[PDB]
Write a protein that binds this ligand. Sequence first.
Ligand SMILES: O=C(N[C@H]1c2cccc(O)c2C[C@H]1C(=O)O)c1cnc2c(c1)CCCN2
Length: 167
Amino acid sequence: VNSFSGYLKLTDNVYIKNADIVEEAKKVKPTVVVNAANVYLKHGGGVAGALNKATNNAMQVESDDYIATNGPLKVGGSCVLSGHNLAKHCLHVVGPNVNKGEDIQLLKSAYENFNQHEVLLAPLLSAGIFGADPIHSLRVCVDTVRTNVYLAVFDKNLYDKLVSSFL
Ligand SMILES: O=C(N[C@H]1c2cccc(O)c2C[C@H]1C(=O)O)c1cnc2c(c1)CCCN2
């Protein structure tokens, strides 16, 4: 039993809810919240900009030190950093950005990072300002992640479309 509330169950291990991931994180304080990161951990907009704003920019300060030490992530890769006031840990995962021409096949590699964590609160990778089809992202999630994932979808219209079209 865990504290996630109000989710629709899609499969054995994948759950989905129309929710603001920032507000969901503040309430649940999950072990892991996933950020929709870029390789530079520049959290300017989308999910990343919103999570960083909720940490009062502490996420960005920590991220800048990480990059100065380690260099950029790979598209499809991840790193574990602090969850600040939102979660124990933040898993920063880089899905491909279609608006940069990145190979959508890398989306499966991106979701594989979730399998290193037993339970996660996450957005749909490569959705939103990353330019991929969220229906496709949900399909890759279900077909790749084997650990327990609680997906937060900000847009109610998109949420209803994702549920109604789910196979
Ligand atoms: O862009 C947002 N989400 C989308 C997003 C962003 C970045 C990467 C992604 O793969 C996605 C999928 C989108 C979604 O999940 O629908 C977003 C933007 N601003 C916000 C919030 C969410 C929630 C807190 C308040 N401010």
